[PDB]
């Protein structure tokens, strides 16, 4: 997260770190057994880490749980990042508490102008490299598709939205991938893709979770 702020320990209790020997992606806890992340975060040997603040220190509120199944969206396109979403089932149910909590799925999509909370342990610099140990947060509004398209020249599918600031300086970044965009207590976005980080006229692009609720629900029902 570039141009954000320190969240505060366990202030984003649905925020997950995916670990494969090191933190490599975020995720969102959607019930005691399932995590939503980005399809581009798929890899073998994922351990889900709940209750994290400092990812390099055991602070006492963590739960580390292996993935038992990973389900990449059937239509994930690794060139365009269309359908950039994945479900991860936990080997064991997380113990839910004030610091490890699920986040609700949308009942309907959010609109341009709505303010959202974006979080993760990704790069904090728009130029160069700095990875935080503690969770970072950013408030950012959803942009209209038309303003985003004209500003960036990006192709934005129906399953994507732009959020952030066209002026640059505030954005998600590498390492935030797969993490939450929460708006009015609903998981509306997943950190997906972009062009650099916090650059002018290059806002963050996010998987539009509202389009996947039926898929998530039926997948969970049958797995
Ligand atoms: N030609 C097409 N259509 N390409 C789609 C993929 C574009 C790709 N862009 S990219 O390489 O600039 C992403 C990046 C890599 C290193 C450092 C900063 C940013 C990209 O974003 N790749 C996946 C990725 O790196 N995702 C992580 C990510 C998370 C947040 C942002 C952000 N600025 N909000 C950007 C990338
Ligand atoms: Ca920790
Ligand atoms: Cl529009």
Curated annotation (Swiss-Prot):
Regulation: Is inhibited by scorpion cyclotide trypsin inhibitor TopI1.
Disulfide bonds listed in the record: 7-137, 25-41, 109-210, 116-183, 148-162, 173-197
A Gene Ontology molecular function term of the record: metal ion binding
Residues binding substrate, per UniProt: 171-172, 174-175, 177
SMART domains from the UniProt entry: Tryp_SPc
Residues noted as binding Ca(2+) in the record, renumbered to the chain: 52, 54, 57, 62
EC number: 3.4.21.4
Major localisation: secreted
Domain of life of the source: Eukaryota
One GO BP annotation of this record: digestion
Location in or out of the cell: Secreted, Extracellular space
InterPro entries: Peptidase_S1_PA, Peptidase_S1_PA_chymotrypsin, Peptidase_S1A, Serine_Proteases_S1, Trypsin_dom, TRYPSIN_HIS, TRYPSIN_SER
Keyword Secreted carried by entry: yes
PROSITE patterns noted in UniProt: TRYPSIN_DOM (PS50240), TRYPSIN_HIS (PS00134), TRYPSIN_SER (PS00135)
Cofactor(s) this protein cannot do without: Ca(2+)
Active site feature: 40 (charge relay system), 84 (charge relay system), 177 (charge relay system)
Post-translational modification: Subsequent cleavage after Lys-125 leads to alpha-trypsin. Further cleavage after Lys-170 yields pseudotrypsin. A cleavage may also occur after Arg-99. Not sulfated on tyrosine residue(s).
SUPFAM superfamilies found in the cross-reference section: Trypsin-like serine proteases (SSF50494)
Gene3D superfamilies per the UniProt record, alphabetical: Trypsin-like serine proteases (2.40.10.10)
Recorded family membership: Belongs to the peptidase S1 family.
Protein's UniProt name: Serine protease 1
């Amino acid at each position: 997260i570039v141009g954000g702020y320190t969240c505060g320990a366990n202030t984003v209790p649905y925020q997950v770190s995916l670990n494969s020997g090191y933190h490599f992606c975020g995720g969102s806890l959607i019930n005691s057994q399932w995590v939503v992340s980005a399809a581009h975060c798929y890899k073998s040997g994922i351990q889900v880490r709940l209750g994290e603040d400092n990812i390099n220190v055991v602070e006492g509120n963590e739960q580390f749980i292996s993935a038992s199944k990973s389900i990449v969206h059937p239509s994930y396109n690794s060139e365009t990042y269309n359908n950039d979403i994945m479900l991860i089932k936990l080997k064991s149910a997380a113990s839910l508490n004030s610091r490890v909590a699920s986040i609700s799925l949308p009942t309907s999509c959010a609109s341009a102008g709505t303010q959202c909370l974006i979080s993760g342990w990704g790069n904090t610099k728009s130029s160069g490299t700095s990875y935080p140990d503690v969770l970072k947060c950013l408030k950012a509004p959803i942009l209209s598709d038309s303003s985003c398209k004209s500003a960036s020249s990006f192709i934005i599918t129906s399953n994507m939205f732009c959020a952030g600031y066209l002026e640059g300086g505030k954005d998600a970044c590498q390492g935030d991938s797969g993490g939450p965009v929460v708006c009015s207590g609903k998981l509306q976005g997943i950190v997906s893709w972009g062009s650099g980080c916090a650059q002018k006229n290059k806002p963050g692009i996010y998987t539009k979770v509202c389009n996947y609720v039926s898929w998530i629900k039926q997948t969970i029902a049958s797995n």
